[PDB]
Amino acid sequence: MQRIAINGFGRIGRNVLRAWFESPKQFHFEIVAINDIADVHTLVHLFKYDSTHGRFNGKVDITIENEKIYLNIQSNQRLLKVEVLQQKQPELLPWASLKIDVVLECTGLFRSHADATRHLEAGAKRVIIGAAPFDHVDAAIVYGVNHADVKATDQIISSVSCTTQALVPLVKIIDDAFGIETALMTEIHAVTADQSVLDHAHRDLRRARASGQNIIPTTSSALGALKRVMPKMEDRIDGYSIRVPTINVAAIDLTFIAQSPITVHHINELLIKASQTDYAEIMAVTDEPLVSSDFNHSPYSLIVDLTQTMVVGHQAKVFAWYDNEWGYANRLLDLCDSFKS
Amino acid sequence: MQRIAINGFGRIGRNVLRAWFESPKQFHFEIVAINDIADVHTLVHLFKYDSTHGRFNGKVDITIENEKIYLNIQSNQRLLKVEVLQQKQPELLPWASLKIDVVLECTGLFRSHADATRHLEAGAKRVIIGAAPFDHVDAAIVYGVNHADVKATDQIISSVSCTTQALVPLVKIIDDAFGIETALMTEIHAVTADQSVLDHAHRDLRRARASGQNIIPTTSSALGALKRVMPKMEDRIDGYSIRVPTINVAAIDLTFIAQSPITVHHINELLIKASQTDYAEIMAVTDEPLVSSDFNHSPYSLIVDLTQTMVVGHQAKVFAWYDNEWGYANRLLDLCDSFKS
Amino acid sequence: MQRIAINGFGRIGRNVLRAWFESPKQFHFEIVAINDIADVHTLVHLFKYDSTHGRFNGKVDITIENEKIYLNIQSNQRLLKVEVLQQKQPELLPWASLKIDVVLECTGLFRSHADATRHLEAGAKRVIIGAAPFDHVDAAIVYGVNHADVKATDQIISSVSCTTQALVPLVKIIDDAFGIETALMTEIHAVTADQSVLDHAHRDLRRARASGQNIIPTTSSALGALKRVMPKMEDRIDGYSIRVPTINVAAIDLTFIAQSPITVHHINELLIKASQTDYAEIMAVTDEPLVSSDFNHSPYSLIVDLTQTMVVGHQAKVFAWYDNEWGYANRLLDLCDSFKS
Amino acid sequence: MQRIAINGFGRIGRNVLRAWFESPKQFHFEIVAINDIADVHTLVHLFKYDSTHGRFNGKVDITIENEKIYLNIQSNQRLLKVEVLQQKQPELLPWASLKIDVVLECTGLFRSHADATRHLEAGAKRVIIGAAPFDHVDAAIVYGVNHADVKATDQIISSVSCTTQALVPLVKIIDDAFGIETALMTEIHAVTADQSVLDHAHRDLRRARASGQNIIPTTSSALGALKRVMPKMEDRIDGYSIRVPTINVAAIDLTFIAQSPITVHHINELLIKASQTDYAEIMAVTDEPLVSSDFNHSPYSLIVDLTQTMVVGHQAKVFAWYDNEWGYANRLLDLCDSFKS
Ligand SMILES: Nc1ncnc2c1ncn2[C@@H]1O[C@H](COP(=O)(O)O)[C@@H](O)[C@H]1O
Ligand SMILES: Nc1ncnc2c1ncn2[C@@H]1O[C@H](COP(=O)(O)O)[C@@H](O)[C@H]1O
Ligand SMILES: Nc1ncnc2c1ncn2[C@@H]1O[C@H](COP(=O)(O)O)[C@@H](O)[C@H]1O
Ligand SMILES: Nc1ncnc2c1ncn2[C@@H]1O[C@H](COP(=O)(O)O)[C@@H](O)[C@H]1O
């Protein structure tokens, strides 16, 4: 069966594996290897215990065999024997011998086309960058929109940011119905590792500042991303992220100018249909009176709070929550399940 | 002097007094009484120490002259004797005998023209409701914009909300020079007192949940304010508000369609000229990459982040800060100062 | 099957009803009625949606009849039909009708014998205050310790606090082993409902203060309870509490003077043999480097951090974690099961 | 006059420079040089805008004379003309050319005896390690206790930690009245720079975990340091530290067995006395019911909460707050203004 490997057992990598076991439907593929620069013990711990998502529900047993290290993981009536590796520089990795079909490059270090091929130079067949693009990419995918539009000879694939997978669907759907003259996105976002616990030295003089005590307006790769997905949107959309002191779950505030005429009802109605039809696998809509932590550990790439939708004249605004760790995790998985086809 | 009194030594009332002593120019009106349902010591204790604004910078001793309790408040080369009262029902309050010129109603219970007038029956000359009008006000005022338009016959007046103080100048300033077709607002606001520390039974099931580790979107009455202030802007602007774990400071995220050519440079250039000339008292602008905490205890009704301004086509977004409690409190005083003809 | 009411559908009351379901051990009794000032719809929201413990996993069918309201609740293959009520005064409540074998008085408003007797007046056969007593109680129980001391005759009982549920084991185990001359307790508790979001008027001027941004030391009627439980430990034990801005999970820090030889190993080993034999049902011990978050939703009365134990001479210090809501909520049930005719 | 320089312009470094300006008493020495690996601009911004301590009241103007970068800071009727340096290797520093009498080491990378000496070999005339000793130093000092015992043979001087600056004067005062058989310290501390914002890989696995959402029991160098100043205390004192989600201000829970009769009264009475006589510059005491943010920006090396003092038999406990950035930093300034003839 298709063999997958994770480079970087960070938040993303860890949650991905967690998802594999937690996934309601067993993914046909299997993860057989994880690479990192840290000791296995540290990782296991972080995989086992998490402040956000909680104790991982199942045993994890390390075994040394020959000289190779292995995570025997069991959970949800499902096993994986993973091989651990401690190679800093990808190029030397043994993806060749392991017959690794798909690398999940989740280190955030090797985002470029050059640094991503290093995994292919190392004998892997297909890389997926678990972040926005840096320079070149053979395709910029958003499972639920253009996961089909992957050529087979594509090798360096990006699946963009968590933010981008809430934005792209909102935009596509609405442009396809009402038209979008120009849009503007505010993103209310939980904290991210990039920030500092206390005022520290940081390039981002904004993210320099105490994560827990500040509202921090900053930027989002998610615009430049979506412009690679919908190159026509170049010079029509913009926006930014705001960081506030919650641990997890984020929102989008999408203001836009419709080209056809719009009512509140109408916009909400469309988004409800869309969530039951084409985008059923990654969208959901809620009227109920909810707040971020209700959407924690929610595998949708976005949920629309419909009550939040507003309209004055041509101008409108919609609101979507999304677990900014866990949606984007199941989308790295859901995409890998699309390649067997 | 012209004599002012406070009803409700709440988060506002206390800050108003603090501001009276902390303001760089002394006001030509004394605060001669306060009144609250809570014990004097509790009030004093919270007058002296504040989690958001640290210690009060001076002395407070409690005299019992006659049968009457008194506060004796020594700070920044200024003194006040201040009679404490403890009457729920504001019609009993002896504003008559104390010869109160102006009340500030700062409890939140008495916002109807009806309820508020009870201070005038108690023998007050004038009342300011420190809150968006409940039903009617002889006028509704935002210092720096329309404060002038108070007539002598005007008896019940509202100083609206912190949001209103920052949302209105932005509209007047932009709408005049550029022309707002429609505009939408997103208010990122710190925790509010009416919230719940853990999840709790409450009318609003959004503002029922854990204030400190939860994002909660909800309503802003600073729209239903703005419309009494600017009648022209009815159906041209709606918006909503978001609670986030910080303890103070808030942001307005204004997003508007223009009836003219708009560049980022030209928007910011206006907002600057407006702060330099027409609104130098209640406005300011910052080029610097600052965050919420940096504007704590800032007296300006709005500080505009110019590196947050954004243009796509005829649509745009401006970004302004304000200390909710302080920005609003200094405007309260600035107002009572203005009635001296 | 006995029949159990819950005056008070707050953190405790609600998490009681949950644990009944989420528990793998099935209780021979059933919960058949709840009461609260709030209206059914609101209780149901909050029963389903919790910030701390997350989405309730089950369906909740609100049934209205000619006057009576019910709650059909389905989860973990278990089904309850639960009458809802809205009556402030527990004297008038119809426990008579419904054959209430036990009330769980989880409001924290009826803690005297007289106020709790209002439930016996209403027709309930037996009460239990879900707090420390306020005066007379026909016993004060800590499950796993003196739950068999329940006299048949005993009507009004108390189940002390979560804090006391943890302190007492420790004391009893150590004293009955090494002998405790005197011992002091430092409790690090997460925010609680009594606390305020911002500085508000309150009788306890420690708890008046903004809960999110303050280390707030204070009282703890765990001691006053521990004395009612272990009478011989009068005068020898005192302690206090500290509120810090986590949402949940507390820790207890007991420094004691032993009346015999003590060494870290022996201290820990003792607690290990306890968590393995006698107290093994409400106790557990962990060698691992954990933090508060990971014990969130843990059913144990105490979990001892054995890496934290220290000894200098005849004085030593042990350390335990506990979930304040869930630890307590499970024990309440366990005690109800203890009452078997 | 003596000429001070700062290696490491971090939390400590920058607060040190700030304190210089704020002190009512113009110190009899000037800070003439700072050094950081980071870029000047960042260093200014952070020195100007702080989340913990607010805006620096003054103005900084960067000047590049010749090929040297200077900082012209003006505040509180004073000016310093600083030089900024980008030299990571201390041996290569120009302390000799700058005629530096005192380097403040605050990088926390050069705590070792050898490494700190690297400064002296650069022409430094005396070095102060702004941390507990790593290996062994010429002398460990606690201003207000033993700041007189400095010899001119002493060139490597450790100012211990913000914690030790409060632990020592308690222990000293208490042993030297009632005696201390043994004693155990619990420390509740605000968050530190070294913690992670989200769960993360790090050497210590408890400081790996999310700073804003956990109580985190860990360790404290303060005992190791106190023994190098009170060697008699070896074997007679231990303790640990806990990190809670607050920005600043920490407290200490000293529990101790007395060697005489003690009553709560006498203990508080001694500490009141001590705070007026000998330890009057570095100590204070409060009867009031106060909380962390009350003592933010408070230059006392400790303050006792006397309401918190407890007694059972020979065992007693006390409690004291301290600003763990501000206090420590004025002690650095107080230590440098001892050395003057
Ligand atoms: N050169 C590298 N090769 C492989 N994994 C790496 C490398 N550098 C960092 N990592 C991992 O990438 C992750 C960093 O992302 P995060 O920890 O989520 O901020 C951690 O799991 C690191 O161990
Ligand atoms: N009937 C009343 N008359 C005057 N002040 C009141 C009354 N009821 C409550 N207050 C005060 O109004 C304020 C409302 O809460 P807050 O403004 O958030 O502090 C508090 O100071 C209350 O103690
Ligand atoms: N008179 C009452 N009878 C029954 N339950 C009550 C009464 N008053 C308040 N409660 C409930 O008790 C709860 C207090 O516990 P907590 O939610 O932890 O603050 C409130 O949320 C109410 O739902
Ligand atoms: N010579 C130096 N070598 C290494 N780090 C330095 C040096 N000078 C300044 N720094 C940095 O200054 C920072 C200030 O401390 P902090 O920001 O609290 O970690 C430290 O992180 C150091 O790395």
GROMACS .gro file of C-alpha atoms in nm, chain A residues 3-317:
model
  315
    3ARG     CA    1   0.381   0.443   0.200
    4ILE     CA    2   0.397   0.792   0.357
    5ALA     CA    3   0.672   0.955   0.569
    6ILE     CA    4   0.673   1.270   0.784
    7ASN     CA    5   0.975   1.505   0.793
    8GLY     CA    6   0.953   1.706   1.116
    9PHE     CA    7   0.762   1.564   1.412
   10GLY     CA    8   0.647   1.911   1.515
   11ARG     CA    9   0.291   2.018   1.598
   12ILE     CA   10   0.178   1.955   1.240
   13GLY     CA   11   0.353   1.619   1.200
   14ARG     CA   12   0.238   1.498   1.542
   15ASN     CA   13  -0.128   1.596   1.487
   16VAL     CA   14  -0.117   1.432   1.142
   17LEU     CA   15  -0.021   1.097   1.292
   18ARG     CA   16  -0.276   1.142   1.571
   19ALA     CA   17  -0.536   1.204   1.300
   20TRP     CA   18  -0.444   0.883   1.113
   21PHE     CA   19  -0.553   0.680   1.417
   22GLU     CA   20  -0.837   0.911   1.519
   23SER     CA   21  -0.973   0.936   1.163
   24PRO     CA   22  -1.329   0.790   1.163
   25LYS     CA   23  -1.244   0.603   0.841
   26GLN     CA   24  -0.915   0.411   0.819
   27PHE     CA   25  -0.694   0.579   0.558
   28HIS     CA   26  -0.582   0.314   0.309
   29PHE     CA   27  -0.223   0.445   0.316
   30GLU     CA   28   0.024   0.405   0.605
   31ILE     CA   29   0.290   0.622   0.772
   32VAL     CA   30   0.610   0.421   0.814
   33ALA     CA   31   0.875   0.682   0.902
   34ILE     CA   32   0.930   1.010   1.089
   35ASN     CA   33   1.243   1.228   1.077
   36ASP     CA   34   1.346   1.494   1.330
   37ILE     CA   35   1.654   1.646   1.495
   38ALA     CA   36   1.535   1.566   1.849
   39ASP     CA   37   1.554   1.252   2.064
   40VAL     CA   38   1.264   1.006   2.032
   41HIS     CA   39   1.177   1.039   2.403
   42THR     CA   40   1.109   1.413   2.377
   43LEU     CA   41   0.886   1.352   2.074
   44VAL     CA   42   0.684   1.060   2.209
   45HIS     CA   43   0.611   1.274   2.515
   46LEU     CA   44   0.487   1.563   2.299
   47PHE     CA   45   0.294   1.317   2.084
   48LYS     CA   46   0.151   1.153   2.398
   49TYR     CA   47   0.073   1.468   2.600
   50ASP     CA   48  -0.057   1.792   2.447
   51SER     CA   49  -0.194   2.109   2.607
   52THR     CA   50  -0.433   2.172   2.316
   53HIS     CA   51  -0.563   1.835   2.200
   54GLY     CA   52  -0.497   1.629   2.516
   55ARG     CA   53  -0.363   1.283   2.601
   56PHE     CA   54  -0.331   1.066   2.289
   57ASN     CA   55  -0.574   0.776   2.334
   58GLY     CA   56  -0.355   0.465   2.300
   59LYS     CA   57  -0.024   0.299   2.392
   60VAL     CA   58   0.309   0.395   2.236
   61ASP     CA   59   0.595   0.149   2.269
   62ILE     CA   60   0.950   0.216   2.149
   63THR     CA   61   1.165  -0.072   2.028
   64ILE     CA   62   1.525  -0.073   1.906
   65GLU     CA   63   1.571  -0.338   1.635
   66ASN     CA   64   1.912  -0.387   1.475
   67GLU     CA   65   2.022  -0.023   1.512
   68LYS     CA   66   1.690   0.119   1.391
   69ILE     CA   67   1.427   0.277   1.617
   70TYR     CA   68   1.055   0.206   1.592
   71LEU     CA   69   0.734   0.350   1.732
   72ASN     CA   70   0.483   0.072   1.782
   73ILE     CA   71   0.166   0.279   1.813
   74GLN     CA   72  -0.179   0.140   1.885
   75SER     CA   73  -0.510   0.326   1.906
   76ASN     CA   74  -0.868   0.313   1.779
   77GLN     CA   75  -0.819  -0.058   1.701
   78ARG     CA   76  -0.534   0.029   1.461
   79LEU     CA   77  -0.155  -0.016   1.455
   80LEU     CA   78   0.146   0.149   1.304
   81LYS     CA   79   0.512   0.053   1.327
   82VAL     CA   80   0.700   0.373   1.247
   83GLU     CA   81   1.077   0.401   1.195
   84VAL     CA   82   1.235   0.707   1.360
   85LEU     CA   83   1.533   0.890   1.204
   86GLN     CA   84   1.757   1.178   1.316
   87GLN     CA   85   1.885   1.330   0.990
   88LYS     CA   86   1.909   1.711   0.978
   89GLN     CA   87   1.977   1.749   0.605
   90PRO     CA   88   1.706   1.577   0.388
   91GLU     CA   89   1.927   1.493   0.088
   92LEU     CA   90   2.091   1.202   0.275
   93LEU     CA   91   1.762   1.051   0.402
   94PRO     CA   92   1.697   0.686   0.298
   95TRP     CA   93   1.352   0.740   0.142
   96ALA     CA   94   1.490   0.527  -0.143
   97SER     CA   95   1.533   0.208   0.062
   98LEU     CA   96   1.209   0.262   0.256
   99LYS     CA   97   1.015   0.300  -0.071
  100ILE     CA   98   0.861   0.626   0.053
  101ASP     CA   99   0.590   0.731  -0.192
  102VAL     CA  100   0.503   1.062  -0.018
  103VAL     CA  101   0.708   1.293   0.205
  104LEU     CA  102   0.515   1.536   0.426
  105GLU     CA  103   0.770   1.817   0.458
  106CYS     CA  104   0.639   1.970   0.782
  107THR     CA  105   0.960   2.129   0.914
  108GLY     CA  106   0.883   2.475   0.772
  109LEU     CA  107   1.257   2.486   0.684
  110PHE     CA  108   1.257   2.332   0.335
  111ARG     CA  109   0.969   2.513   0.163
  112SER     CA  110   1.154   2.605  -0.158
  113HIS     CA  111   1.145   2.397  -0.477
  114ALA     CA  112   1.520   2.338  -0.438
  115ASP     CA  113   1.504   2.222  -0.076
  116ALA     CA  114   1.193   2.013  -0.142
  117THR     CA  115   1.349   1.812  -0.429
  118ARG     CA  116   1.624   1.719  -0.183
  119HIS     CA  117   1.370   1.459  -0.060
  120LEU     CA  118   1.325   1.337  -0.418
  121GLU     CA  119   1.703   1.339  -0.473
  122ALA     CA  120   1.697   1.117  -0.163
  123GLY     CA  121   1.472   0.864  -0.341
  124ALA     CA  122   1.121   0.977  -0.242
  125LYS     CA  123   0.867   0.989  -0.524
  126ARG     CA  124   0.638   1.277  -0.421
  127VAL     CA  125   0.683   1.557  -0.168
  128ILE     CA  126   0.402   1.758  -0.012
  129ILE     CA  127   0.503   2.085   0.152
  130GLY     CA  128   0.288   2.129   0.463
  131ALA     CA  129   0.297   2.509   0.432
  132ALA     CA  130   0.257   2.793   0.182
  133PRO     CA  131   0.502   2.800  -0.116
  134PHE     CA  132   0.835   2.982  -0.095
  135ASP     CA  133   0.942   3.008  -0.460
  136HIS     CA  134   0.825   2.740  -0.703
  137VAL     CA  135   0.580   2.453  -0.670
  138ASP     CA  136   0.449   2.197  -0.919
  139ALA     CA  137   0.096   2.262  -0.779
  140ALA     CA  138  -0.087   2.456  -0.503
  141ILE     CA  139  -0.362   2.232  -0.374
  142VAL     CA  140  -0.662   2.287  -0.147
  143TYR     CA  141  -0.837   1.955  -0.081
  144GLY     CA  142  -1.203   2.013  -0.180
  145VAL     CA  143  -1.141   2.262  -0.463
  146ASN     CA  144  -0.854   2.145  -0.686
  147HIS     CA  145  -0.729   1.818  -0.531
  148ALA     CA  146  -0.843   1.665  -0.861
  149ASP     CA  147  -0.634   1.907  -1.066
  150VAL     CA  148  -0.312   1.726  -0.967
  151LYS     CA  149  -0.119   1.592  -1.267
  152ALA     CA  150   0.059   1.263  -1.189
  153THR     CA  151   0.402   1.404  -1.287
  154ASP     CA  152   0.356   1.671  -1.018
  155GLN     CA  153   0.620   1.613  -0.750
  156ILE     CA  154   0.658   1.929  -0.541
  157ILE     CA  155   0.306   1.994  -0.409
  158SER     CA  156   0.206   2.261  -0.157
  159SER     CA  157  -0.116   2.235   0.044
  160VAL     CA  158  -0.083   2.599   0.157
  161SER     CA  159  -0.176   2.724   0.508
  162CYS     CA  160  -0.469   2.642   0.739
  163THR     CA  161  -0.592   2.997   0.677
  164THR     CA  162  -0.585   2.945   0.302
  165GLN     CA  163  -0.813   2.640   0.323
  166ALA     CA  164  -1.086   2.846   0.493
  167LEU     CA  165  -1.044   3.144   0.260
  168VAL     CA  166  -1.017   2.975  -0.083
  169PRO     CA  167  -1.355   2.789  -0.048
  170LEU     CA  168  -1.539   3.100   0.080
  171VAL     CA  169  -1.403   3.300  -0.215
  172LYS     CA  170  -1.449   3.042  -0.492
  173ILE     CA  171  -1.812   2.973  -0.394
  174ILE     CA  172  -1.908   3.341  -0.358
  175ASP     CA  173  -1.724   3.460  -0.673
  176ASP     CA  174  -1.893   3.174  -0.861
  177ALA     CA  175  -2.239   3.291  -0.747
  178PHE     CA  176  -2.245   3.667  -0.683
  179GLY     CA  177  -1.902   3.772  -0.813
  180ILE     CA  178  -1.641   3.946  -0.598
  181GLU     CA  179  -1.523   4.288  -0.717
  182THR     CA  180  -1.271   4.316  -0.433
  183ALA     CA  181  -1.249   4.139  -0.095
  184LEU     CA  182  -1.067   4.198   0.236
  185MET     CA  183  -0.991   3.936   0.501
  186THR     CA  184  -0.938   3.984   0.871
  187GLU     CA  185  -0.827   3.666   1.047
  188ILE     CA  186  -0.872   3.635   1.422
  189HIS     CA  187  -0.618   3.370   1.517
  190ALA     CA  188  -0.511   3.182   1.829
  191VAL     CA  189  -0.144   3.202   1.928
  192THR     CA  190   0.128   3.029   1.725
  193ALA     CA  191   0.476   2.909   1.822
  194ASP     CA  192   0.633   3.200   1.630
  195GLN     CA  193   0.519   3.444   1.902
  196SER     CA  194   0.714   3.521   2.220
  197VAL     CA  195   0.605   3.444   2.576
  198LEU     CA  196   0.755   3.778   2.680
  199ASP     CA  197   0.881   4.083   2.489
  200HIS     CA  198   1.178   3.918   2.316
  201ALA     CA  199   1.400   4.001   2.017
  202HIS     CA  200   1.210   3.900   1.700
  203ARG     CA  201   1.224   4.018   1.337
  204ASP     CA  202   0.844   4.058   1.358
  205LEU     CA  203   0.854   4.353   1.599
  206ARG     CA  204   0.482   4.273   1.640
  207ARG     CA  205   0.526   3.902   1.728
  208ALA     CA  206   0.817   4.006   1.952
  209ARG     CA  207   0.556   4.090   2.212
  210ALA     CA  208   0.410   3.873   2.489
  211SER     CA  209   0.174   3.623   2.326
  212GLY     CA  210  -0.057   3.602   2.628
  213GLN     CA  211  -0.111   3.974   2.699
  214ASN     CA  212  -0.133   4.128   2.353
  215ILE     CA  213  -0.360   4.161   2.058
  216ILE     CA  214  -0.102   4.145   1.777
  217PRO     CA  215  -0.209   4.253   1.423
  218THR     CA  216   0.030   4.084   1.181
  219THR     CA  217   0.040   3.933   0.828
  220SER     CA  218  -0.069   3.610   0.660
  221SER     CA  219   0.100   3.402   0.389
  222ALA     CA  220  -0.258   3.302   0.305
  223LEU     CA  221  -0.313   3.582   0.053
  224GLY     CA  222  -0.005   3.517  -0.161
  225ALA     CA  223  -0.104   3.150  -0.135
  226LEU     CA  224  -0.463   3.185  -0.260
  227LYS     CA  225  -0.329   3.399  -0.545
  228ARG     CA  226  -0.130   3.094  -0.661
  229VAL     CA  227  -0.455   2.894  -0.640
  230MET     CA  228  -0.674   3.159  -0.812
  231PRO     CA  229  -0.423   3.376  -1.005
  232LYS     CA  230  -0.713   3.596  -1.122
  233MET     CA  231  -0.769   3.713  -0.763
  234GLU     CA  232  -0.435   3.897  -0.786
  235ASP     CA  233  -0.509   4.263  -0.708
  236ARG     CA  234  -0.865   4.197  -0.588
  237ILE     CA  235  -0.821   4.052  -0.237
  238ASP     CA  236  -0.609   4.146   0.066
  239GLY     CA  237  -0.613   4.114   0.446
  240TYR     CA  238  -0.416   4.022   0.756
  241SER     CA  239  -0.408   3.810   1.070
  242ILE     CA  240  -0.463   3.920   1.430
  243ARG     CA  241  -0.315   3.715   1.717
  244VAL     CA  242  -0.509   3.694   2.042
  245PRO     CA  243  -0.424   3.502   2.362
  246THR     CA  244  -0.620   3.178   2.310
  247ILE     CA  245  -0.437   2.849   2.256
  248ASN     CA  246  -0.619   2.718   1.948
  249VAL     CA  247  -0.904   2.771   1.698
  250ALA     CA  248  -0.918   3.071   1.464
  251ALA     CA  249  -1.180   3.271   1.271
  252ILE     CA  250  -1.205   3.450   0.935
  253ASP     CA  251  -1.375   3.785   0.873
  254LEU     CA  252  -1.425   3.811   0.496
  255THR     CA  253  -1.557   4.145   0.372
  256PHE     CA  254  -1.641   4.156   0.000
  257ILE     CA  255  -1.828   4.351  -0.270
  258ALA     CA  256  -2.082   4.140  -0.461
  259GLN     CA  257  -2.132   4.197  -0.835
  260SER     CA  258  -2.483   4.056  -0.855
  261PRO     CA  259  -2.733   4.175  -0.587
  262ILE     CA  260  -2.712   4.007  -0.246
  263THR     CA  261  -2.932   3.966   0.060
  264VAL     CA  262  -2.826   3.824   0.397
  265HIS     CA  263  -3.053   3.520   0.347
  266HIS     CA  264  -2.913   3.453  -0.001
  267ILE     CA  265  -2.545   3.441   0.096
  268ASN     CA  266  -2.614   3.211   0.393
  269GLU     CA  267  -2.835   2.991   0.173
  270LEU     CA  268  -2.562   2.937  -0.088
  271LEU     CA  269  -2.305   2.843   0.176
  272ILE     CA  270  -2.546   2.589   0.328
  273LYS     CA  271  -2.612   2.424  -0.010
  274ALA     CA  272  -2.239   2.423  -0.090
  275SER     CA  273  -2.168   2.244   0.241
  276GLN     CA  274  -2.416   1.968   0.148
  277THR     CA  275  -2.302   1.928  -0.212
  278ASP     CA  276  -1.952   1.980  -0.351
  279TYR     CA  277  -1.780   2.097  -0.034
  280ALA     CA  278  -1.955   1.859   0.207
  281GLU     CA  279  -1.625   1.693   0.302
  282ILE     CA  280  -1.463   2.012   0.436
  283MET     CA  281  -1.737   2.266   0.515
  284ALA     CA  282  -2.011   2.305   0.773
  285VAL     CA  283  -2.247   2.586   0.867
  286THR     CA  284  -2.378   2.675   1.212
  287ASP     CA  285  -2.647   2.909   1.343
  288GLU     CA  286  -2.593   2.798   1.703
  289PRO     CA  287  -2.438   3.053   1.944
  290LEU     CA  288  -2.083   2.924   1.966
  291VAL     CA  289  -1.735   3.043   2.059
  292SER     CA  290  -1.389   2.933   1.951
  293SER     CA  291  -1.320   2.645   2.192
  294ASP     CA  292  -1.640   2.470   2.078
  295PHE     CA  293  -1.469   2.425   1.740
  296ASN     CA  294  -1.157   2.274   1.897
  297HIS     CA  295  -1.053   1.945   1.740
  298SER     CA  296  -1.300   2.006   1.454
  299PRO     CA  297  -1.178   1.839   1.130
  300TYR     CA  298  -1.345   2.088   0.894
  301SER     CA  299  -1.130   2.331   0.698
  302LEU     CA  300  -1.392   2.589   0.798
  303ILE     CA  301  -1.729   2.628   0.969
  304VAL     CA  302  -1.956   2.923   0.888
  305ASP     CA  303  -2.123   3.105   1.174
  306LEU     CA  304  -2.426   3.204   0.966
  307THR     CA  305  -2.574   3.444   1.224
  308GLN     CA  306  -2.262   3.656   1.175
  309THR     CA  307  -2.328   3.715   0.801
  310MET     CA  308  -2.411   4.081   0.726
  311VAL     CA  309  -2.502   4.291   0.420
  312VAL     CA  310  -2.520   4.666   0.362
  313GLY     CA  311  -2.571   4.747  -0.005
  314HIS     CA  312  -2.321   4.575  -0.233
  315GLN     CA  313  -2.088   4.510   0.064
  316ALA     CA  314  -2.105   4.197   0.277
  317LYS     CA  315  -1.916   4.006   0.546
   0.00000   0.00000   0.00000
